[PDB]
Design a protein around this ligand. Structure first.
Ligand SMILES: C=C1CN2CCC[C@@]2(COc2nc(N3CCN(C(=O)/C=C/c4cc(CN(C)C)c(C)cn4)C[C@@H]3C)c3cc(Cl)c(-c4nc(N)cc(C)c4C(F)(F)F)c(F)c3n2)C1
Ligand SMILES: Nc1nc2c(ncn2[C@@H]2O[C@H](COP(=O)(O)OP(=O)(O)O)[C@@H](O)[C@H]2O)c(=O)[nH]1
Ligand SMILES: [Mg+2]
Length: 170
């Protein structure tokens, strides 16, 4: 059978969670996606020879800390922590997402990838070194992406799958 990987895309509003997801799923860049639509999308993919079923949760809606919401988010096996490279606030929010994920997974060792999205844009306010340094602080990979050009998109999600595989071998 296919191994299913439950991947969760998190990050501040407008960083490109939906656009990254749709690029992975539909191979198309979406200029506009309703920011209140949270949905899960599936795609069968081959990663390192293995046929995988990716289940991608594109998070949306008001932040909510309830048992129900935590229970749901806790089903994620790996998390893309997305900021936009032209939005310093979205970068400064990353530790909040990291902290919430560690909380609901009750683990310091959750499969995670730091994603700096919108690298196609000229107006970057978060330089690569600071983002690499934050990923190093967390012990996780850092991948620069563009949902618009597809730069890094496969790498971001596939790296997350490889992280989950490695974690499950403990
Ligand atoms: C430091 C902080 C704490 N918050 C207070 C200040 C802000 C902050 C948010 O903080 C914050 N915002 C979350 N929003 C709201 C904002 N977004 C959006 O795309 C909304 C975009 C948007 C865009 C537009 C259009 N524009 C152009 C304007 C409009 C009109 C409206 N909306 C992302 C996500 C759904 C959020 C979502 C989730 Cl699921 C979780 C979460 N909850 C759990 N229970 C457990 C876990 C393990 C998580 C985690 F996995 F995700 F981690 C959080 F933790 C979250 N925290 C960041
Ligand atoms: N130029 C560029 N724009 C992007 C990229 N990713 C997302 N966007 C745009 O940023 C806006 C918000 O993207 P969206 O996926 O809705 O962000 P979300 O709130 O995190 O789901 C939309 O206009 C997208 O077209 C990217 O890699 N490059
Ligand atoms: Mg969205």
């Amino acid at each position: 059978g296919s191994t299913e990987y439950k991947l969760v895309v998190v990050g501040a509003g407008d960083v490109g969670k939906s656009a990254l997801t749709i690029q992975l799923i539909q191979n198309h860049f979406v200029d506009e996606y309703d920011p209140t639509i949270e949905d899960s999308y599936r795609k069968q993919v081959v990663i390192d020879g293995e046929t995988c079923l990716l289940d991608i949760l594109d998070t949306a809606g008001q932040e909510e800390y309830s048992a129900m919401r935590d229970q749901y988010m806790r089903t994620g096996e790996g998390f893309l922590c997305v900021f936009a490279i032209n939005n310093t606030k979205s970068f400064e929010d990353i530790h909040h997402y990291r902290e919430q994920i560690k909380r609901v997974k009750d683990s310091e060792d959750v499969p995670m990838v730091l994603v700096g999205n919108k690298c196609d844009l000229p107006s970057r306010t978060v330089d690569t070194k600071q983002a690499q340094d934050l990923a190093r602080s967390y012990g996780i990979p850092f991948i620069e992406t563009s949902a618009k050009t597809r730069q890094g998109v496969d790498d971001a999600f596939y790296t997350l799958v490889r992280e989950i595989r490695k974690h499950k071998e403990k």
